[PDB]
Each structure stands twice: as C-alpha cells, then as structure tokens.
Amino acid sequence: TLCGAELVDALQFVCGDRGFYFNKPTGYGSSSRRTGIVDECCFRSCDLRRLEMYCAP
Amino acid sequence: EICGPGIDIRNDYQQLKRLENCTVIEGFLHILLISKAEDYRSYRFPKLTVITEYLLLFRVAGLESLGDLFPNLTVIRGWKLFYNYALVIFEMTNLKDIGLYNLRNITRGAIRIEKNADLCYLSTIDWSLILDAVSNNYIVGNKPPKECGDLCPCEKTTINNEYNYRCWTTNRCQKMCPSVCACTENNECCHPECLGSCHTPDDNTTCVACRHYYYKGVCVPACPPGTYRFEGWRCVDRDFCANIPNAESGFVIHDDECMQECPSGFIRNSTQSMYCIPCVCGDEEKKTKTIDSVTSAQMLQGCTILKGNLLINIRRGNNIASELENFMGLIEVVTGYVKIRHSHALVSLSFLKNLRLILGEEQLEGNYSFYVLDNQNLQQLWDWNHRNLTVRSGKMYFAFNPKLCVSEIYRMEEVTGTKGRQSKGDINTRNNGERASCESDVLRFTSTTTWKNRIIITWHRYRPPDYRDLISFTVYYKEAPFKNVTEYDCGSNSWNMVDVDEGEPGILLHGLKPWTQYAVYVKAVTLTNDHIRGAKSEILYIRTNASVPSIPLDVLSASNSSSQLIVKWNPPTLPNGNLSYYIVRWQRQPQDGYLYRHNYCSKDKIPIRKYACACPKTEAEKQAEKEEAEYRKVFENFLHNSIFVPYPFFESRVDNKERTVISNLRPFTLYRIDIHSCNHEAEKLGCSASNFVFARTMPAEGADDIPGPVTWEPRPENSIFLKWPEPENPNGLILMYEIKYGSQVEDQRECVSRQEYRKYGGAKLNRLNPGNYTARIQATSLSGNGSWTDPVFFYVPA
Amino acid sequence: EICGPGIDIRNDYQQLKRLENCTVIEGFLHILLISRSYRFPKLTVITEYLLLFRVAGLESLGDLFPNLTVIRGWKLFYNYALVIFEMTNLKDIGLYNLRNITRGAIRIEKNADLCYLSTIDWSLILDAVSNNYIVGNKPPKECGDLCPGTLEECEKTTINNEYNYRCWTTNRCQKMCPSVCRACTENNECCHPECLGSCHPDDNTTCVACRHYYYKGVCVPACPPGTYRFEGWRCVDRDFCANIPSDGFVIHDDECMQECPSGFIRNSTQSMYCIPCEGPCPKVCEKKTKTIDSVTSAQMLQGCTILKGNLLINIRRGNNIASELENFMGLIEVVTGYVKIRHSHALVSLSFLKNLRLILGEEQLEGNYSFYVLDNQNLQQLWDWNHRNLTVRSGKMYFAFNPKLCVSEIYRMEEVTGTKGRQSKGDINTRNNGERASCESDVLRFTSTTTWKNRIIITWHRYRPPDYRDLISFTVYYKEAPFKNVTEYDGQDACGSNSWNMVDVDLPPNKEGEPGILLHGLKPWTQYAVYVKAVTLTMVENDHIRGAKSEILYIRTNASVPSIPLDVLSASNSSSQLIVKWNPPTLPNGNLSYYIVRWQRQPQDCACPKTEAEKQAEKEEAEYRKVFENFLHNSIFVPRPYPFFESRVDNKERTVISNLRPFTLYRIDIHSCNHEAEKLGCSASNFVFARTMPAEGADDIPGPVTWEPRPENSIFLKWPEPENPNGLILMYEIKYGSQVEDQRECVSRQEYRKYGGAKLNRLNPGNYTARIQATSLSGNGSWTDPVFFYVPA
C-alpha cells in the first residue's frame, strides 16, 4: 500500500519523461463525471501494472 | 483578450506557451508537476491580469518567485472555488517569494499556502485589505519565523497588532489606497464601476479591470436587455450563447442569463429549445454523497429530488452555513439515510429548510435512518413547528452532541411520530447536550449560613410531577473572585460536586478557605418515556466569615542615617478580610555587659559590630521535601492559634505602603522591630501574630574624639599621669586608648583600659627616661579606631 | 514521685506551677508562648523529648531546670530529642547537668543570643553527634564567650583538633568524670556503673537516674519475672497495669503495653494476653453501605481487612488519589455484600484494592447483582490480572457506559473468577463499554542501547502504520524503579504525575533516520524502567483505533566512583593510640567493598513539557492536512480509457591505630572504595587532624638541675635539656627563693637554648633554693626536684 507523498514521486518513477494523461475538457459543460486514486492505492494495495493507466501514452 | 475554459499546465514546460495570447482566463488555471529538469528561461507573460476561478500551483520544481511569471495579475473573482479556496500553492520547492504585487482585490475564497518552507515574506503582506474572510485562510508549515527575518527594500499599517514592512519581495512593496474610497494609480477613487485600479480616474472604459460585469469595453452594474449575465463577469448577446459549444452532453436563456440546465419542470420549449418553459440529481452507483466543502456541495446546486444518502461533515470555517443554505435549500426529498459526524461549524441544521419527506429506504446498520455523532458546536436542530417532517422508516440515534437541548429531540420525535420506536440507548441521555441545557423548573434557597470555615446550605424542598421519582440533588461550587463565570462543566479550579438525599433538604460544605467568595448552585438529578424535567437553580454568591490574619514577611530594614530606619516588608499571604493596616513596635537593646564586665584592652583581639531545563524532582528527594514541609507545618500550627492585643515600646499605624521610616532614636544602638498585619475585623477578632527582625542604627562616628585638650603632669619616679576627658557619647562603647609618645617620634605605643581610666582619670607610665618628649592619643570605640589627637609636649629633664 | 502523662503549657506563666510537686516526667514537655523568678529543683529525668518555642523573657534554662540530668528520649519528636526555636533574650543554655542524651539529636535554630555553644562538647553526652542542626544563632565572631576562670579555669579538652575549656555558662563548667573506671559522682568517685548521671559511690540505692532500668530504688538490668518493665525505665507487678485505666495495657513479653504490636491478637481468654496468629490481624468494621468520595472519608477503614457490607465508590476528583487511597483501604480481604462504583471519574484503574480474594455478596443488589460498575469516564484497567486468585460466588456482574475499558479485558473476568454461567447476555453491551479505548495494538520492538554511568541512549524499531501519513510522534516514559513488580498504571489517575516521568520526541527529519533518544540527569547504578508508546492521532480504526506501544524494558547505568565518606571524627582512649569513627557514605554507586585509611605525621613551627491545550490542537492540523491532501490526488490524476601508612577498613566504621608519638599531629584521611575502583579509581578525600594528647611524666626536667657558684654574684642553673620531653618545652618556669621559692624565673628556649641553663645575676647574699616546672608540650604538671642554689656568705 502507498499513500501520501510516497505516491507522487513513485508515479514519476513510473512515468519519468512520458508525463501523465489528462482528459482535456473543451466545450466546458457545467458538469463532469468525477473514483480516484487513494480510493484504490490507499485503502488496498495496487501493483506497478495498473499505474500505467495514469501515465501518459 | 479572453480564453476559456481552462488551462492544464502539466509535465511540459513548453506547454506553457498556451498562455501566449490572452488576459481574461475564463474557467480555471492549473499548473502542476513541472520538473526543473528543464532550465528556467523566464517565460514572461504580461498581458494576463484576471482569472475568473481558482488558481492552482502544485510541484513546479524550478520556480523562484511569482512576479517573474505573473507581473499583471490583479484580481481573481473565484466563481467556482477549489475546496473552499481561490488560490492554492502546494508542494513547491525552489520558490522564494510571491511577486504578486499587482493583486489588489480577491472576492470569494481563501488562500491556503502550506508545506513550502523554501519560502518566506509571509508575515508581512496584509490580506484583510484584499478579501474579507481572513479567518478562513490557512498558512503554516513554511519556514519557521526565527530563520527568516526578512526586511523590505514602504507603507506601514498595523498587522493586527503593529506595523512593519509590507513588501511582496525584496524589490517591490505592498500598494495601498488612502481613505478616499475604487482607486487609481495615484490616489483617487475612480468610476465606482471599478475593481483593482483604473488607468485614469472616473471613466466607463479606462478601468484596468472593472468589477460587477463586463461588456464591449464598458463596465455596467446591469446588462442591457438584449444582453445576458454570463459567468458573473460579463454581458452577452443572444447569438453568442446561441453559438456556445456546450459539450455537456447553445445555453438556455432564463432570468436573462445563459444557464445550461433548468430547474425541475422547466423543459426546452418546442422549437424554442433555446428557452425553458414550465410544464433529481445523483447517481445509482455510489448511493452516497459526502459533503465537506463548497465544491463538494456547489456541484449539487439546483436539485430538489435526491437519491442516495446525505453524509455530511465539515471541519472548520466561518459561516459556511450561509453558503450551504444558498444551495441545498432547494432539496426536498431524499431516499437513503442522513448522517453527520465531527462537524464543527454546523451551528444549526437550519440550511436544509425545504426538506420535508425522508424515505430512509437504504438504511444504515441496525436499519438506522437519522444518524448524528460527536458534532461539537451543533446547538439546535431546525425542527420547529414550521417545518414538519415525516420520517417513513428506519430509526434515529444521537450521541455526544453537547450543545443541543435534550428536549429538542422530544419535539422531533413528536413531529416524526416515532416516540414509540427507540430505546433509552438508541437515543442516549447521559451524554448529549449535557454541557448546556435549555430550561427547566426553578429552585429556591431556603437559607444559607457562614462560619469562618464552614457553611450549611438549605434549598427549598422540591416536589416532582410524579412523587415516586426519587428527586435527588447535586451541588456545584468553587471559588469565584468575579462574575465572568459560567456554571457549566477540579485541578485548575473547575468545579467540585457533592451528592445528597421529614426535614428540609440541606447540605454541609466544610473545611473552606476563610473569606473566599464561593459561588454555589444546586441541580436536580432525577431517579426514574421522555417525561423527565430536572431543575436548575441560581448562581448564588457567598463570602465566608473573616478570620485572624497571618504574619507579614519580607522583613528587611537599614539606616539611611542615624535615628532613621527604613523597613520594607510583604503583605500577608492570607489577609482573610479586607486589609486595614499594620503595626510596628520596637525596643532598645541593652548592650552586652560582658564588654563592660571583661576589659579587652589586655585582650589580644577586639570585637566589631557591622551595622545596617526542569530536572524532574526524583523520588528520594521528594520524600524528605514533603517531610520537611510537614515539619514546618506542625510547627507553625501552634503560633497560628494565638491572639494579640494591639524600656517601653513605641507603636505605629501604617496602612498604605509596606515600608516605613522611623525617627527619634539614639545613635548606633541595637534595635529590634516587631511587626504585625492587622485586618479590619480585629476589633473583636484580635490582631495578627508577630514576626520580628533585628537592626543596628548608624554611627556616633565623630564622637570618639577626646572632648578637650589632652593634658599631662609629672610625678615622682617618672610617672606621667595624663588627663583627657572621656568622650561622653562613645560610638557604641569605648574600650581602650591608643597612647603613642616618645622622645622624637611617638614610636612607643601604650594601651589604656577603662578600669584604670575610672580608677585614676587617665593613665600613668612610671619610671620614664628623661629627655624631650611629646605624646598623642587615639581612642578605641566600637565602630573602630578613634582619632590620633594633638601632639602635646612634656620634657622631664636629665 | 511519678508525673504524667504529658505537659502542655501555654500563655499562662502561672500555669508553670503545674510542676510544683513531681520529680520525674513520664512523657513529653512542651513550652510555648509565655509573656520573672522561678526554680524547679525537683525535676531530674525525662523520658520523652523537650520543646521550647518562642517564650520570650527567659534568662537561661537551668534557672528553670537546675537538675535536668539525663533525658532518655523514649518517644522522639520528628526524630529529635531536644528542640529550641526562636527564643529571644535567651543568653545561654542554662542546662548544666544533662548527661546521657539517649536517642535523638539537638535541633537549635534562629535564636538571637544562644552563644556559649562551641564551648560545650556533645560527644560526651550523646553518641550520634553529627546529626545535629545549628544555624541562625549569633555568628561565632560576635559574642566570644569566656569561661569561669579569667585567672584560672575547669578542664579543657580536644575536639575537631582544638583546645578550649568546657563550660555551659560563665559561672558553670561541664564536668568530665575522668577515666577512673565509668559512671561517676561529684568529687570523682567510681559509682556502681549500673547507675547514670550522679550518685550520692558503689551505691545501688543512692543515685539519681538508674541507667538501663529502675526498680524499687535499685538499679538493675533485668527486673524479676513478676515485675514487668514499663515505659523503658520502671517495672511494676502484674495487677498494677491491669487496675490502671478499650481494655488496659495488655501483657506481652514482660510489658504492660498500650497496644500489643503487630504479629499478634488478644486471646480473649484472659484478654490481657495477646497470642501471635497466622493472619494479618483480622479486624472487623451497622449498615452495609460505606460511601467513599475523597481521601478522608475512608479513614475509618484503615486496616480492618474484613467489612460487613458493601462499597459505593464515587470519587469526582482530588490530588494524586490512588497512592494514599490504597494506603488507606488497600488491606481489605473479603467484603460481604455487593460492590458498586458509579459516576466516579478520577479513577483510572481499581488496582488500589490489594487483597480482595473472596466476595460473597450475602446481600445482593437488585436482581441479584454483586459487582456493579457504572459510568466512570476514566477507568481503563481492572485489577483482574495475571496475579489474582479473586473469587466471587454470588450475584451477576454489570458493566455500562464506561468507554475506556475494552470488552476483551472484562472477557477474561469470568474465566478467572469462576462466575461464567451466572451472568445474562445483554450485560456486556459491547455498544458502549470499550468504544474509545485502545486495547488491540501493534507492538513496537527495540534495536539497541548504550548506558553511560549518567546518560542513556536507546533506539527502537521504525513504525509503519497501514497508512504512511498517520502522524507518528513517539512518547516515551521512564521511572526510577528498584524492582520489577511494576506496570504502567500507578499514577496515571487523571493526574499522571506520580510514577511515570514522560518526555516527548518528535518525528525525525530524516526520511530513514531511526528514532532514538538520549536521557540525562540520572542516578548511577539505579535500575530505571522505560518504555515507549506510539502517539497516533487519527481514526486508524477499521473497527476501533489501533495505537501502538512498546513492551516494558529495564535498564541500569554503568557504575561509577563513590563519594566522600561522612563525619571523620576520632578520639584518643590513650596517648599513642587513636580510635576513629566515621559515617558510611551517601551514594555508594555500587556495592561497597572497603575503605582506605592513611595517616601521616606533621611538621612543627530547556524545559520539556507539552502544553496539552496545544497537544490535541496539533492533532487536528496534521489530521486536517490529511483530508485536504486526498482531495488533491483525487482530482488531478485521471486514468486513460614524613612517612605515611595504609590499612584496609573492610567491614566496620571504626578502627584504632597504634604505635604513634604522643601529642604529634596527624592528617587523617579516609578513602572509600566501591567494588569498581579497581578499574576506575577510589574515593575522593576527607581529612581531619587528631593529636594524641599526652602524660605529665616528661614535662619537668628529670635530669638533675645543678646551680653554679659563678663570677660576679650569680647562679647558673645548668639542668641538661630532657632528651624526650612530653613533646617539647615552650618556656621554662623556675620558681626560686630562700628556702620557700619566693619568685619565678621565666625562660623560653629562645632564652634557654643559647644558654642551655639559667643564670640569675646580682644576688643578695644568703642561702636560696628553687624548683622548675617547665611549661612543656604537655603543660606544667610534675615538678622538678626543688633545686638548692643556696648562696649564703
């Protein structure tokens, strides 16, 4: 399990150069479907496999 | 130039180029996760001056200050906050200061700056002149103060206690505006449609960034008809909102605003979808929706039907209640349970005004429906005879909530028709609202009394609604020097309780400090349905009988001169009654006759009279310490039990100070000085006991001189009797006489006692060799040497 | 004539005449706060202490007590025998006949005129002198008393290596009876040593205070078996005390004692005899309830281990309750009816009850309740232990509304009390009892530690909660603990300041800097006991909060060097022999081994408290940062779709030394080694001088003093200089005359050596004679043969 700042750096250590993925908003609907991370990796443990889901392509 | 609806600076320093163009940032501004791996080239961006909504900074390694990046940022209105805030900077290394001089006015949120010790110049800049809710800001965790000590290169206004250098860096300073008002570059309140500053005063167009709306270079407080109110900062045409790319998946004109959705029952008119005509939010997935911050709540605005749950908890802040009302009020109906925990600024749930119909379908454990817990400063449920409320199912619960009234729950269970549902546990009574109750029956004190140490209180005998309720009593009390005291719940003087059960019910408090204004009041404890009442009572004051005072202290004294004595002391540690005065007595002291009784001329040595961390206390030490204290205690216990009526003595009555000067005294004499405190109640009580002191008056120096000419005479075998008078007032006591004499130098030295001097009237050295001779005398008083008197001559021939 | 039982005197000088009749005081003697001329020659001997406090207007003491001779100090006063305090205008201690102060030690302080002090020995009137207390009198440079003789004295003596006479007041002298035998009388007769003080010689019926006992006018060391001792001095027959005025003074071991001591109880059969039993004095104590609220209201229960009824414990608050609360009640064995504790908060654990073994409940409570506890805010720990053969045999137990006690503790109850199947099932309402305690925990461990004689460094493991962020601010406790029967609930009674000193460490700034601590300000060779508890801050509760504490650990500092031994004093039983007395040390700093003694002749001519109001305040902050944090991550990221000699004082505080030279000084040093000096080094130093004072055999010249018919009329008294005078001659004194020596010759050695004799010139012809008493280092004692320098014509 990882939480806290121990999270953020770890993600760099999995991303490094590639950066992160962001779902860019364009037309600014006054709404958004926003389940996150500490729900996942700070209540149970998560693998270095699924972290790619957040790293940029 | 404007831009919308948001910027996402992330991982790509280069990406910053997206701010090349505009100055009105509609939406938000994210700047996050920028490693300093790329070198800093000072990408200046001057055109930008205002952003509608929040500004976020997170982990941009490689930035030193802010002005370098943002010179012209002046105002951020903050329409949609970011967790109750407007600008937040978090986890920033490299960052030395906030060069944001141009900012003057920020409207809605608060500033949260945290966990960046890499920076200082914080305790300088005043915000209160920018925004209002200073008590909602949050700044700690940056570099400790005693390592910063920064000094400006400007104006100085008290920062809540005192003024200092208010400068946004070592190169700029905090602007301001005098009491003229808007404001201009040089001291003038511009056209009142302004915000921040104006180029030139009093113009509809030259204002740097004008408030309250925007339109076609003009600043209006009310848009024209063809226009509409857009994003709380501008006015628009029909066509523009008709061409907006909603991408919500054209805005609806309503109340002259381009709002995207519509309240209940307001549907896109047939072929006028651009307008809503009159003829419910939440998802089935989560089934619950916590509410902590305005963002977590503003994203709920505009609903009346609700499905899911209402978990609510808020940790701190100002009247968030205002805002939560300004949104949640539209809610009427909820399916699932309602639950509250640890909330602290929820003075009263009044903001859920239009809720009437609760389902409580998906109940909590124990099939619970209405659930509160531990919320401290909640004092009143909105349940009043206006808002009825029909809880369908489930059960209730309350616990620990100390500011509501234990009868409000009763009106609640009334209105909701569940008075035959829950047990004594399911709605606790031991520990809810107990720290402040509403109201109950009054009681009356039968009679008081007072000795010097004890007191017997009698209240009026109470009678309950149903007599088989054992109506016992408690009696709260303490010392009270004042009246700025509550009554409600040891150590640092908090309280002390006592219990008590055909005579009138009274109680006896005992072993009390004399003359201490105790405050007392009784409280009714029941011994048994919610048909309980109890009964509070009145805050009664009582001052216990006076008592004999305690001896003074600090007893010190000296002589600024002969027959003058200065003595300073300490008021008693236990006056025990309004102070009246002190008494001072004194006595001469008979000189030590043994000096008389035993001549010390022959003695080889003569006497003289001087005048006028926390290392934790271990166990073994503490033992003997307590024993010593007990010893002194059992010792002075005797002297404590004595009265005292107010060479002879000579008295005094000093009242004002604790120090006094005494006259009319013989010079250089030993005196002793009894002292007493004396309260104003010793008329029949008796004045205080005694603590003494010693002192010795000042020389007298100047009287050890022989009071005349020293005269000689010759005799048979050469015995020269000398005649010199005794100095009548010796400095204390005269012992002997230094007698120098001789042929040419008075090198030979002679000692002369006081017996022979009283035996003959002088001294006489017998069988002296002839020649020319002269002699001198010095005295030997108590203070010291005498004075080597005049050489007088005598020549027994050869 | 007896005189008892005590004497209280105050505010009435005339009340003094309450002494007119009696001669021996059988008790204490207080004198306090009197506003003339009185004498009391009857008083001879006391048995209890004697106290004088602020009685102004008194000349001396003996003028009020001219025959106080011995004070046997049988009942002290705060470990004292004679105490003076604040006696203005008291010039001098008039008591000039006190002889053998038995037990206590003097306590004299703050008196304006109590001179004539150093001129009084203590070593010949009591035996523990160095426990005295003398301060605040006339500083020794301001009176300078004299002694009866301005011309000639009584005797002078040594103490602390100096000379002066021994006189109480300017008209009395202290009287050492010489080493003739050793009990004495006036005029130096050897009395029958079985008496004490004075003797009116070898008398068993004519003395003042029979030492060691008294009976029927006869000194005696053991009175006959019908005569039982009494008050430490006098015996009486059997019926006497019985007929003396709760029964009288029961008989035990030849004593008629007021209360026969511990380890017995009265055989009601002849109730004046008490038999030793096995139990610790089973004493009993109308109604069945007995409330307790504070420390006092228990007073009427101290000791009676068996109570006929119940207990209702209701304490709101107070001082450090548990200690003395237990010391009052801690002896109860078996209470009859029920036990109940309600609304009482200042309690933390009920351990203060030591010996509750059987609780029978013959008076059950409503619905057959025997054990009832209810709404106690701060109770955490029941004495139900790994160390109780507690037994209950009636009534159901009951528990309600006590947060700080988790159900797992009370669960072990019935399986150690044998009351399992008796209680109902809704009693332990696991809803509330034990909510907010913390009895499940993760256990810390230790890593290492180092122990300097006065500093300790300890380091423990690194903790890692299920979540990293949860604050870790370790809090460490220790206490001085000479044993092992100790666990962490002693003073933590909402006060907490009794038996656990506590300090706080903070999280290390290093990411991996292992957190340990140094402690200072310690006591060498004194076993400490420490442990450390991990202060979480938050609801790490999955069901209830976790918390984490170490397990208790004992330690002791490395040993170290002893300190200076105490009270190096010494007396000469004879010349050329010296006996030493000194006091064992103060901080042995380890098992003592032995002492070191040497002698040598000498030549000729940053506070660390935690403001709790900030403490919990600090919790929320780091807590508040927690929740705010998670919102950040929850909204940013998004997934893709001069020689000297030495001896070994080994066991005793007293050793002689032999074969010296008389009247020769000696620096005396005692050193004391622990069992550690062999590798560390031995004591510091303590010095004292003690001249083996002589011996008048060699004061006069034992060689013949020969005159000489000289040139122009003169007499040369050539006595040879004695080879070994009693040390040496200061100056010679030759009384000379016709046939009765009429004048005296004064000859210093400065005036003798250069001569080697004595010359008297220009004599009137006619026969003469003389004699010499050379003032030697032993003084002018024995006289020479009266020399005959007859010079007739």
First to last CA, chain A: 25
* Residue B19 CB contacts under 8 Å (≥ 6 apart), including other chains: B3, B7, B45, B48
Among B58, B373, C273, B247, which residue's Cα sits nearest to residue A23? B247
Among B301, B49, A41, which residue's Cα sits nearest to residue C633? A41
Q: Write the CA distances from A30 to A26, B27, B259, B280, B307, integer angstroms.
A: 11, 11, 9, 16, 20
First to last CA, chain C: 76
Å between C466 CA and nearest CA of chain A: 8
For C592-629, b/e burial (b = at least 16 CB within 10 A) is: bbbbbbebeeeeeeeeeeeeeeeeeeebeebbebbebb
In this structure, the strands spanning C455-460 and C446-452 are antiparallel
Give the chain A residue nearest B26 (alpha carbons).
A28
At how many degrees (to 10) do helices C612-636 and A4-15 cross? Answer: 30
Number of other CB atoms surrounding residue B785 within 10 Å: 11
* Residue B387 CB contacts under 8 Å (≥ 6 apart), including other chains: B353, B355, B356
CB within 8 Å: C469 and A2: no
**Listed resolution, Å:** 4.3
Give the chain A residue nearest C639 (alpha carbons).
A54
Domains and CATH numbers, chain B: 1-176 (3.80.20.20), 182-228 (2.10.220.10), 237-278 (no CATH), 290-416 (3.80.20.20), 445-543 (2.60.40.10), 556-696 (2.60.40.10), 711-796 (2.60.40.10)
Query: Phi and psi (nearest 5°) for C381?
Result: -140, 125
Using a CB–CB cutoff of 8 Å, tell me whether B27 touches chain A.
yes
Q: Which chain B residues contact residue C170 at CB under 8 A?
A: 594
Domain extent, residue A20, equals: 1-57
Give the chain A residue nearest C630 (alpha carbons).
A38
> Which one of C469, C640, C641 has the shortest CB-CB distance to A3?
C469
Using a CB–CB cutoff of 8 Å, tell me whether B745 touches chain C.
no
Distance in angstroms (rounded) separating the CA atoms of residues B68 and B53? 22
CB within 8 Å: A38 and C466: no
Contact B574, B549 (CB under 8 A): yes
Distance in angstroms (rounded) separating the CA atoms of residues B18 and C635? 22
Q: Which chain A residues contact residue C512 at CB under 8 A?
A: none
Q: 3-class DSSP state for residue B59?
A: strand
Dihedral angle sign, alpha carbons of residues C385, C386, C387, C393: positive
Query: Phi and psi (nearest 5°) for C385?
Result: -140, 180
Q: Calculate the CA dihedral of residues C177, C180, C185, C190 and round it to 10 degrees.
A: 160
Residue whose token pair is 């208790």: C552
Q: CB-hemisphere CA count at 13 Å for B631? A: 13
Contact B532, B432 (CB under 8 A): no
Distance in angstroms (rounded) separating the CA atoms of residues B714 and C651? 78
Residue whose token pair is 């270079």: B217
CB within 8 Å: B260 and A5: no
Residue whose token pair is 């006869």: C218
Using a CB–CB cutoff of 8 Å, tell me whether B246 touches chain A.
yes
Element housing B675 (H / E):
strand B670-679
CB within 8 Å: B11 and A28: no
Q: Which chain B residues contact residue C523 at CB under 8 A?
A: 618
Distance in angstroms (rounded) separating the CA atoms of residues C492 and C501? 11
Number of other CB atoms surrounding residue B486 within 10 Å: 8
Number of other CB atoms surrounding residue C440 within 10 Å: 12
Using a CB–CB cutoff of 8 Å, tell me whether C212 touches chain B.
no
Q: 3-class DSSP state for residue C71?
A: strand
Q: Which chain B residues contact residue A27 at CB under 8 A?
A: 5, 244-248
Contact C543, C606 (CB under 8 A): no
Distance in angstroms (rounded) separating the CA atoms of residues B88 and C771? 116
Q: Which two tokens stand for residue C730?
A: 């200061």
CB within 8 Å: B33 and A24: no
Q: Write the CA distances from C658 to B618, C158, C161, C580, integer angstroms.
A: 45, 19, 19, 12
Q: Which two tokens stand for residue B47?
A: 């055109």
Residues facing C265 on adjacent strands: C275
Q: Write the CA distances from C116 to C59, C95, C96, C104, integer angstroms.
A: 13, 12, 12, 21
Å between A47 CA and nearest CA of chain B: 22
Å between C633 CA and nearest CA of chain A: 7
Distance in angstroms (rounded) separating the CA atoms of residues B229 and C164? 114
Q: Quote the radius of gyration of chain B (alpha carbons, Å).
A: 47
> Which one of A1, A36, A57 has the shortest CB-CB distance to C633?
A36
- Which chains neighbour C (Cβ–Cβ under 8 Å, 3 or more pairs)? A, B
Domains in chain A, number: 1
Q: Quote the radius of gyration of chain C (alpha carbons, Å).
A: 40
Distance in angstroms (rounded) separating the CA atoms of residues C701 and C719? 7
Residues facing C743 on adjacent strands: C736
Q: Which chain B residues contact residue A15 at CB under 8 A?
A: 11
In C76-188 the beta strands, taken as DSSP E runs, fall at 82-85, 106-109, 134-135, 156-158, 163-165
Contact B552, B675 (CB under 8 A): yes
Give the DSSP per-residue string, B403-455: SS-TTHHHHHHHHHT-TTT--TTTS--SSSSTTS----B---EEE----SS-E
Residues in chain A: 57
Using a CB–CB cutoff of 8 Å, tell me whether C629 touches chain A.
yes
CB within 8 Å: A30 and B261: yes
Residue whose token pair is 């109860």: C332
> Which one of A3, A21, A39 has the shortest CB-CB distance to C640?
A21
Q: Which two tokens stand for residue B7?
A: 């910027």
- Which chains neighbour B (Cβ–Cβ under 8 Å, 3 or more pairs)? A, C
> Which one of A5, A22, A29 has the shortest CB-CB distance to B10?
A22
In this structure, the strands spanning B579-588 and B670-679 are antiparallel
CB within 8 Å: C640 and A2: no
Q: Which two tokens stand for residue B204?
A: 């509809």
Q: Is residue B206 exposed (0-12), middle (13-18) or buried (19+ Cβ within 10 Å)?
A: middle
Q: Which two tokens stand for residue C321?
A: 């309750």
Using a CB–CB cutoff of 8 Å, tell me whether B594 touches chain C.
yes
Among C158, C124, C181, which residue's Cα sits nearest to residue C575? C158
Among B30, B31, B23, which residue's Cα sits nearest to residue B3? B23
In this structure, the strands spanning B711-713 and B720-723 are antiparallel
Using a CB–CB cutoff of 8 Å, tell me whether C554 touches chain B.
no
Q: Calculate the CA dihedral of residues B353, B356, B359, B364 and round it to 10 degrees.
A: 30
**B590 alpha carbon, distance to own chain's centre:** 58
Distance in angstroms (rounded) separating the CA atoms of residues B28 and B51? 7
> Which one of B8, B59, B248 has the shortest CB-CB distance to A31?
B248
CATH code at position A31? 1.10.100.10
> Which one of C112, C346, C480 has the shortest CB-CB distance to B618?
C480
* Candidates C59, C632, C633, C637, partner chain B, best to mutate (most B CBs within 10 A): C632
- Which chains neighbour A (Cβ–Cβ under 8 Å, 3 or more pairs)? B, C
Contact B783, B610 (CB under 8 A): no
Q: Write the single-letter amino acid at B719.
A: S
* Residue C326 CB contacts under 8 Å (≥ 6 apart), including other chains: C351, C352, C353, C354
Å between B268 CA and nearest CA of chain C: 33
Gaps in chain A (C to N over 2.5 angstroms) fall after 34
CB within 8 Å: C468 and A6: yes
Contact B140, C628 (CB under 8 A): no
Distance in angstroms (rounded) separating the CA atoms of residues C170 and C270? 59
CB within 8 Å: C32 and B638: yes
Among C576, C584, C550, C735, which residue's Cα sits nearest to residue C653? C584
Give the DSSP per-residue string, C622-670: HHHHHHHHHHHHHHH-------EEEEEE-S-SEEEEES--TT--EEEEE
Distance in angstroms (rounded) separating the CA atoms of residues C298 and C304? 11
CB within 8 Å: C637 and A11: yes
Distance in angstroms (rounded) separating the CA atoms of residues C286 and C274? 27
Q: Which chain B residues contact residue A56 at CB under 8 A?
A: 11
CB within 8 Å: A5 and B12: no
Element housing C751 (H / E):
helix C749-752
Å between C655 CA and nearest CA of chain B: 31
Number of other CB atoms surrounding residue C652 within 10 Å: 7
Using a CB–CB cutoff of 8 Å, tell me whether C85 touches chain B.
yes
Q: Which chain A residues contact residue B11 at CB under 8 A?
A: 15, 19-20, 56
Q: Which chain B residues contact residue A25 at CB under 8 A?
A: 5-6, 247
CB within 8 Å: A42 and C639: no
Among B259, B324, B337, which residue's Cα sits nearest to residue B296? B324
> Which one of C466, C467, C638 has the shortest CB-CB distance to A23?
C638
> Which one of A19, A29, A56 has the shortest CB-CB distance to B246?
A29
> Which one of A8, A36, A53 has the shortest CB-CB distance to C634?
A36
Give the DSSP per-residue string, B158-193: -SSS------SSSS-------TT----TTS----TT
What one-character DSSP code corresponds to residue C763?
P
> Which one of B491, B592, B615 has the shortest CB-CB distance to C317?
B491
Distance in angstroms (rounded) separating the CA atoms of residues B343 and B404? 14
Write out B95-122 in H/E/C secondary structure: CCCCCCCCCCEECCCCEEEECCCCCCCC
Q: CB-hemisphere CA count at 13 Å for B62? A: 17
Q: 3-class DSSP state for residue B380?
A: strand
What one-character DSSP code corresponds to residue B55?
E
Chain B, 256 to 275: residues with Cβ < 8 Å from chain A are 260-261
Give the chain B residue nearest A17 (alpha carbons).
B11
* Residue C784 CB contacts under 8 Å (≥ 6 apart), including other chains: C700, C701, C702, C705, C719, C771, C772, C773, C774
